[PDB]
Amino acid sequence: ASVYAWNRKRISNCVADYSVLYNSASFSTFKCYGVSPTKLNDLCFTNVYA
Amino acid sequence: YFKIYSKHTPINLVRDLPQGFSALEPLVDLPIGINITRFQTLLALHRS
């Protein structure tokens, strides 16, 4: 979607492997602010939105 | 985040609200992410 009408999707009731996101080289920028990138596999979250 | 808190109380007062204390238990945590400014309740008709 366009930036004015950005799409928001809920992620819930799943187990997420973030290691495939860090180790993938396709992303030019992988920058995290309130969480460390390497610690994402060790934490539990709810109400995740993309 | 749309929070629904609910409580059911057995009452026997005829017209107005009873006077007392009853804490509302949290019922539903709803992920909507939309703007809400106006609401309307739904009633049921009886047909004869």
UniProtKB/Swiss-Prot annotation, chain A:
Effect on the protein upon substituting residue 26 to P: In strain: Omicron/BA.1, Omicron/BA.2, Omicron/BA.2.12.1, Omicron/BA.2.75, Omicron/BA.4, Omicron/BA.5, Omicron/BQ.1.1, Omicron/XBB.1.5, Omicron/EG.5.1
Effect upon mutating residue 24 to L: In strain: Omicron/BA.1
Subunit and interaction comment: Binds to host ACE2. RBD also interacts with the N-linked glycan on 'Asn-90' of ACE2. Cleavage of S generates a polybasic C-terminal sequence on S1 that binds to host Neuropilin-1 (NRP1) and Neuropilin-2 (NRP2) receptors. Interacts with host integrin alpha-5/beta-1 (ITGA5:ITGB1) and with ACE2 in complex with integrin alpha-5/beta-1 (ITGA5:ITGB1). May interact via cytoplasmic c-terminus with M protein. May interact (via N-terminus) with host bilirubin and biliverdin, thereby preventing antibody binding to the SARS-CoV-2 spike NTD via an allosteric mechanism.
Role: Attaches the virion to the cell membrane by interacting with host receptor, initiating the infection. The major receptor is host ACE2. When S2/S2' has been cleaved, binding to the receptor triggers direct fusion at the cell membrane. When S2/S2' has not been cleaved, binding to the receptor results in internalization of the virus by endocytosis using host TFRC and GRM2 and leading to fusion of the virion membrane with the host endosomal membrane. Alternatively, may use NRP1/NRP2 and integrin as entry receptors.
Protein name (database record): Spike protein S1
Organism from which the protein derives: Severe acute respiratory syndrome coronavirus 2
Entire protein: shown range: 348 to 397 of 1273
